[PDB]
């Protein structure tokens, strides 16, 4: 994985800084239009968040059709040398996100800045306001489903012994109090730990050090499968992100998430 090879997946401001003029590098920014422009990550490319996304009912959390992503990623500079370093500036959500988008195309090299922009701006690091130029047309794609668990899947392995559900949601919405769907609940045998739980606002964001510890405490741990969701695949971007950096093996994201179950005829629902 060239410069970055020798990082673990979640790296610090620190690190990123040194190696901003790696030829291999393709930095991903989700924050917003406005944020990117006032100031970002030099060198660092813009993907609007609702690019992420489908956007389509009935499950506009699922991965966006094969020609949007061809083209966003070609737009990227993907290519066989890149090592993908992403952000956003609220915590990991859609940097997450962007994480199982690249496990969805198989881009094996990637890192998560931890904290993001935030940790970088309370660094007070370098900012640009420049726009790199755009790699190229569209790439043709390879695109891979084991990221990503469909709503057919995940009714099939309900109750079992081998799964966790790690519900990324607020408590009130897991209880069935805040209701944004037909159904208010959760999914049967599901655990909570909102991705805000997962933050450290005392270290600007970052992922929280004792993170493990508490996943464990629910029963999310790494001889399980582990399914991720909230409403719609946003939230649940943090929360696959770091399962995978704490290397649990088996991790999917349920990207239907309550915007479906919560609405489908076929789902059960648990208060």
Same mark, same amino acid.
């Given at each position: 994985?060239?410069?970055?090879?020798?990082?673990?997946?979640? !790296?610090?401001?620190?690190?990123?800084?040194?190696? =901003?003029?790696?030829?291999?590098?393709? =930095?991903?920014?989700?924050?917003?239009?406005?944020?990117?422009?006032?100031?970002?990550?030099?060198?660092?490319?813009?993907?609007?968040?609702?690019?992420?996304?489908?956007?389509?009912?009935?499950?506009?959390?699922?991965?966006?059709?094969?020609?949007?992503?061809?083209?966003?990623?070609?737009?990227?500079?993907?290519?066989?040398?890149?090592?993908?370093?992403?952000?956003?500036?609220?915590?990991?959500?859609?940097?997450?996100?962007?994480?199982?988008?690249?496990?969805?195309?198989?881009?094996?090299?990637?890192?998560?800045?931890?904290?993001?922009?935030?940790?970088?701006?309370?660094?007070? *690091?370098?900012?640009? %306001?420049?726009?790199?130029?755009?790699?190229?047309?569209?790439?043709?794609?390879?695109? +891979?489903?084991?990221?990503?668990?469909? %709503?057919?899947?995940?009714?099939?392995?309900?109750?079992?012994?081998?799964?966790?559900?790690?519900?990324? *949601? @607020?408590?009130?919405?897991?209880?069935?109090?805040?209701?944004?769907?037909?159904?208010?609940? +959760?999914?049967?045998?599901?655990?909570?730990?909102?991705?805000?739980?997962?933050?450290?606002? @005392?270290?600007?964001? %970052?992922?929280?050090?004792? !993170?493990?510890?508490? =996943?464990?405490?629910?029963?999310?741990?790494?001889?399980?499968? !582990?399914?991720?969701?909230?409403?719609?695949?946003?939230?649940?971007?943090?929360?696959?992100?770091?399962?995978?950096?704490?290397?649990?093996? %088996?991790?999917?994201?349920?990207?239907?998430?309550?915007?479906?179950?919560?609405? +489908?005829?076929?789902?059960?629902?648990?208060?």
């Amino acid at each position: 994985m060239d410069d970055f090879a020798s990082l673990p997946l979640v !790296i610090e401001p620190a690190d990123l800084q040194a190696r =901003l003029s790696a030829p291999e590098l393709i =930095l991903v920014d989700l924050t917003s239009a406005a944020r990117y422009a006032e100031g970002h990550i030099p060198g660092a490319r813009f993907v609007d968040p609702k690019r992420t996304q489908l956007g389509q009912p009935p499950a506009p959390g699922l991965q966006p059709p094969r020609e949007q992503l061809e083209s966003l990623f070609g737009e990227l500079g993907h290519r066989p040398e890149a090592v993908y370093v992403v952000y956003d500036d609220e915590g990991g959500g859609w940097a997450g996100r962007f994480i199982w988008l690249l496990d969805v195309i198989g881009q094996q090299r990637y890192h998560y800045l931890n904290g993001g922009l935030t940790a970088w701006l309370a660094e007070d *690091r370098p900012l640009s %306001r420049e726009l790199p130029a755009p790699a190229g047309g569209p790439v043709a794609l390879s695109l +891979h489903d084991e990221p990503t668990a469909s %709503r057919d899947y995940l009714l099939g392995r309900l109750g079992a012994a081998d799964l966790a559900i790690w519900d990324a *949601r @607020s408590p009130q919405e897991y209880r069935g109090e805040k209701v944004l769907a037909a159904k208010g609940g +959760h999914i049967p045998g599901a655990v909570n730990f909102e991705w805000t739980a997962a933050m450290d606002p @005392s270290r600007a964001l %970052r992922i929280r050090t004792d !993170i493990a510890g508490r =996943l464990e405490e629910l029963g999310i741990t790494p001889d399980k499968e !582990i399914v991720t969701h909230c409403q719609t695949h946003h939230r649940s971007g943090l929360t696959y992100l770091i399962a995978k950096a704490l290397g649990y093996p %088996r991790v999917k994201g349920y990207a239907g998430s309550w915007g479906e179950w919560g609405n +489908h005829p076929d789902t059960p629902v648990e208060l």
